[PDB]
């Protein structure tokens, strides 16, 4: 009975209710690891068949096959959707801009600055600050991320014929959040959804 | 390539032209070492310092140029570029087959491109290394209308009203990319919305 | 050494893209500018004016030397900033303590214990601290990078061309905050705080 | 000579606490301006002078107080918490330091060594020679006194331990912890709990 | 022969100064946007149109100016000082070269040869044919015009002297020195080399 | 004695200083590589391009300086220098023994040299790397009186009349050379005639 009443509302929402909060997300070429290929107007992230030799840049992940969106949000309510190739290792999440770009601890969910849902093939996890949380398998090839910066939470939704809670974190976000993407297996691809 | 349709286009206002709007985005792989991209791949600007972009066969190695990602062989397409008032830049179109090396790669200096060029105040139109002097204009915006159905491109000076700058009737032999040229300290092209 | 000497060798070996990890916007402060220094392009450019600017008297304002400071100072963290300069002119790029005297020739950057600078004079380059000069090799570079480390107490002046190159450095355990400091003193002389296009806008 | 200084200079907090001492403040030394609280662990500046009984031990000029015990042999470490944005000093003195006149101020005489906060600016003092020190976020100072090899070290205590300053002296008599509180909000708390 | 040209390519500053001549800018030829200063020694881009009287010899379209004198025989060497980051051009035209239309731009006709600074990029231009030259830090160019053996050399002039480009040509008339300046900042200064004597 | 004679020279008119006139001519072996000599060894001007002067132990390798041919250990000597209004330049005296290398060879930055310096509009007096700020002046000409007998040098500003800029009392230990310093584009020093 505080603003957990807002959280309880958002967890109940249908697709058409979440699409009210739709944002365009465009991948930031400066952040992409050498192993991550950008395509379809910077909309699709895939494991390139060989490392890409991108220029050095303070924004660029040097260690983990990761890439960030261009825009960050420190206020308002934002929803985006990402289609996954089934039977692959990838992650979809959010991170502070101050998240490290170097080291094994730059891995999405392996630090305090990042929050994600992983697929190791069929098995699904939620991660934050190097705590894993095993979840029920889903056949859904699409995740919806709802970030509420006004009332400090994020929700990961599996999106099929309907929409089902995968996980959520309440946090007092200390700075703006960037959409974050992780691709690992040869065949991994994360497509940001446009219409 | 109908003579009647072309007259229709030349008489169209902005709102009539905006009917064929496409969203153009700059192709990071084409931008020259001294052209920075910004505002979500929307703005091209001359950089004093090298950007050290990777080698790529698509990359302009000599002229301060960058292409869109998408080309067009059918239909009708319109896009706008805002330019810095007192600067040196070119807005045009080119075949993907256009050379990326040497002075031959300069927009309007080869068979593969058509463009309108600002030299501070001295406006020109170019194709196959042939220049045409055009009147000055205060307009800081050009609209490109590409008609791949009836093979013509029109360059419009966009201000309070729309005014013709030049046009090229051509039986296009492959797809056109939007093409951008910026070559002076402080020179920028911004694709509009 | 072991820890303060090795974190310095790491910063000394850094490239431009690595140095830009620590980039900070610097704004020139109209309250500090000598009467003969005009500010322009949103307090980004310092030039000699032919004719006085008639600024508000201010205790922080340089009365003798054609100098100006940035608005913000730094007592922790790692800060990089880049200054474009005109070729054949008299100018200096530096840091100082807020406590630095604003009057007299003593207030000239590097001529006192509260300031450290690199200085272009005629065609020759010198590092100054505490009125001690060090001759530097001439460079074609028309851009200087200042790396200030307030966590481990050193400042590095880089010549920024196609690569970065060491001009000079100072270790000092800093006793207060450092302000970016600028000197311009020839009819045409100008310094420009860069907004590197390498970084997002 | 000095190799034992270098060892102590390198020590971490848990290696210093090997030499920990309880320090209690002496009610008889305390100036009228200094209030004493907790269990004679805390020196604050009273809202009004306290009117303590006269006593040969009592500071009559400077707002100062000593610990009960003194040390002429062994190695001793203690920590004091301060309010960050105030005027205060933490040191050691000879029992023979004057309790009278402007000369009795901590560090203004050959009989005392301390570290001083003038709000944000930090100084070390001895024999009325001020030395300007690096400012730090530390709200705690650690005093290591080695009477055996004749030096004192003041450490800033935060997450880690940073040198503020040290003095090499052939100490000619026992040393008392010494405390100066000046500004209305000034507070020095001796650490155990 | 080609031997006389091998000797001039190999000449140093001191050897080339043997043929120094004073160039003065011809205030009758200067486009309305080309201010002359310091006794017809400096060509800059005027902020306002300079309101010269019309004249048939005057440049109507291009920001261009010629020397007073031309040269049909002998050996001549001059030095122009330029500002680093500007559109500018240094060369030689026949007097018969056109003053009107974009055919009048230096290097964009058969009447002229030049070396051009396209901000950072350096070109040699003859008869609307462009050749690409390595970038130099040099802010001074040396034209050596040998009328007697038909060639012109453009030298970059810094601590030593470096070839930029040369043209062989059996010239058919008198060559004027020719200057192009086109950007707010642009200035060309005809040098009075201090190596030589002022008394 | 050394102060009564000093007062007599401070009170002298221009014509009375020209009693002690010397022709000063520039020494080609001392001229820095970017210092050109012109008008029969009378004008020192900053050169953009190196002049390729032969190596010489007497030549200034860092500072844009040049000395006169002759030095003086006895007598009273007066010469004048015309400066460019808004420029960077120095006029002084120095020992033969003054360094010709490095920043320490700069006029007035060593114990072997005394000068008056223009930094555009800021006038200074220098000796042994000690600066005395001086009032500015519209005068574009300095007159140097060197008294080697009573051991003092005066720097006069010369316009319609003559005004003290500064004076140094020295027990001079060796001969004094006229010293010149030009350090900006288009800076020139001119040694005046009758």
Chain C residues with CB under 8 Å of B64 CB are none
Domain extent for C44: 4-192
Q: Could you say which of F103, F133, F183 has the minimum Cβ distance to residue C133? A: F103
Cα angle B175, B176, B180 (rounded to 5 degrees) comes to 155
Nearest CA in chain C to E84: C87
Strand partners, E34: E45
**Chains C and E: how many Cβ contacts under 8 Å?**
3
Cα angle D153, D156, D161 (rounded to 5 degrees) comes to 85
Beta-sheet strand order (sheet of B113-119): B65-67, B176-182, B88-95, B113-119, B122-127, B130-133
Q: How many domains does chain A have?
A: 1
Q: Catalogue the E-assigned strands of chain A.
A: 36-39, 44-47, 66-68, 77-84, 88-96, 114-121, 123-128, 131-135, 142-148, 153-159, 163-170, 177-183, 189-192
Partner-chain contact E123 B133, CB within 8 Å: no
CB A27 within 8 A of CB A70: yes
Resolution for this model in angstroms, one decimal place? 2.7
Q: How far is E51 from chain F (nearest CA, A)?
A: 30
CATH number of the domain encompassing residue C116 = 2.60.120.920
* Cα distances (Å, whole numbers) of residue C68 to C62, C112, C167, D137: 7, 16, 22, 29
CB C198 within 8 A of CB B49: yes
**Residue F87 CB burial class (10 angstroms; 0-12, 13-18, ≥19):** buried
Partner-chain contact D121 C174, CB within 8 Å: no
Task: Please report which helix (H) or strand (E) contains residue B112, including its range.
Answer: none
Indicate which of A23, A34, A39, A42 best probes the interface with B, i.e. most B CBs within 10 Å of its own CB.
A42
Chain B residues with CB under 8 Å of E121 CB are 62
- Residue written as token pair 């450095």: C169
CB A194 within 8 A of CB A58: no
Tell whether F43 is within 8 A of chain E (Cβ).
yes
Q: Could you say which of F46, F124, F184 has the minimum Cβ distance to residue C186? A: F184
Chain E residues with CB under 8 Å of B183 CB are 118-119
DSSP chain C: --SHHHHHHHHHT--HHHHGGGB----B-TTT--TTEEEETTTTEEEE-SS---PPP-TTS-SSSSEEEBS--BSSSEEEEEEEE-SSS-EEEEEEETTS--STGGGSTTSSTTEEEEEEETTEEEEEETTEEEEE------EEEEEEETTTTEEEEEEESSSEEEEEEEE---SS-EEEEEEE-STT-EEEE---TTS--
Q: Could you say which of F86, F102, F120 has the minimum Cβ distance to residue C135? A: F102
Q: Is residue E198 domain-resident? A: no
Residue B42: closest CA among A60, A24, C190, E28: A24
Task: Please report which helix (H) or strand (E) contains residue B189, including its range.
Answer: strand B188-191
User: Six-digit token pair at C87?
Assistant: 């070729």
Q: In this complex, which chains have at least 3 CB pairs below 8 Å with chain E?
A: B, C, F
Residue C152 and residue F155: Cα distance in Å, rounded?
A: 50
Nearest CA in chain C to A101: C21
Tell whether C16 is within 8 A of chain B (Cβ).
yes
Partner-chain contact D121 C176, CB within 8 Å: yes
Residue F120: closest CA among F93, F84, F91: F84
Residue D93: closest CA among D71, D111, D78: D111
Tell whether C162 is within 8 A of chain E (Cβ).
no
CB F159 within 8 A of CB F148: no
Tell whether B131 is within 8 A of chain E (Cβ).
yes
- Residue written as token pair 């000394």: C12
Q: In this complex, which chains have at least 3 CB pairs below 8 Å with chain B?
A: A, C, E
Which three-class secondary structure state does DSSP give residue D10? helix
Q: Is residue E197 domain-resident? A: no
Nearest CA in chain A to C19: A58
Nearest CA in chain C to B44: C197
DSSP D118-185: EETEEEEEETTEEEEE---S--EEEEEEETTTTEEEEEEESSSEEEEEEEE----S-EEEEEEE-STT
* Cα distances (Å, whole numbers) of residue E87 to B87, D30, E122, F86: 12, 80, 10, 30
Residue D75: closest CA among D147, D157, D7, D169: D147
User: Six-digit token pair at A119?
Assistant: 């697929």
User: For E174, which DSSP code?
Assistant: P
Which three-class secondary structure state does DSSP give residue A26? coil
Partner-chain contact E119 B62, CB within 8 Å: no
- Residue written as token pair 């053996």: E149
Q: Could you say which of B40, B52, B69 has the minimum Cβ distance to residue A26? A: B40
User: Six-digit token pair at F194?
Assistant: 């009758």
DSSP D68-102: S--BSSSEEEEEEEE-SSEEEEEEEEETTS-SSSG
User: Six-digit token pair at A64?
Assistant: 């983990």
Cα angle B114, B116, B117 (rounded to 5 degrees) comes to 125
Residue E193: closest CA among E112, E40, E96, E77: E77
Indicate which of E61, E102, E185 best probes the interface with B, i.e. most B CBs within 10 Å of its own CB.
E102
**Chains A and C: how many Cβ contacts under 8 Å?**
17
Partner-chain contact C124 F62, CB within 8 Å: yes
Provide the Cα torsion C171, C175, C176, C181; round to 10°: -40
Q: Could you say which of C75, C153, C175 has the minimum Cβ distance to residue D133? A: C175
* Cα distances (Å, whole numbers) of residue D173 to C91, D64, D109, D125, D150: 57, 20, 15, 19, 11
Chain F residues with CB under 8 Å of C34 CB are none
Partner-chain contact C198 B45, CB within 8 Å: no
Tell whether B103 is within 8 A of chain E (Cβ).
yes
Residue A98: closest CA among A58, A130, A126: A58
Tell whether C197 is within 8 A of chain E (Cβ).
no
């Amino acid at each position: 009975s505080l603003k957990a009443k807002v959280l309880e509302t958002f967890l109940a929402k249908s697709r058409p209710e979440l699409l009210e909060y739709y944002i365009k997300v465009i991948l930031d070429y400066n952040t992409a690891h050498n192993k991550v290929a950008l395509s379809e107007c910077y909309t699709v992230a895939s494991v390139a068949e060989m490392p890409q030799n991108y220029r050095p840049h303070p924004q660029r992940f040097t260690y983990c096959s990761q890439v960030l969106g261009l825009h960050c949000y420190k206020k308002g309510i934002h929803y985006w959707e990402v289609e996954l190739q089934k039977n692959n290792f990838c992650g979809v999440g959010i991170c502070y801009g101050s998240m490290n770009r170097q080291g094994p601890e730059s891995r999405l969910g392996r630090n305090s600055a990042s929050w994600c849902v992983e697929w190791f093939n069929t098995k699904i996890s939620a991660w934050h600050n190097n705590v894993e949380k095993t979840l029920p398998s889903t056949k859904a090839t699409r995740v919806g991320v709802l970030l509420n910066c006004d009332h400090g939470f994020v929700i990961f939704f599996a999106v099929a014929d309907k929409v089902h809670l995968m996980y959520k974190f309440r946090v007092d976000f200390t700075e703006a959040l960037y959409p974050a993407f992780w691709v690992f297996s040869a065949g991994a691809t994360l497509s940001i959804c446009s219409p």
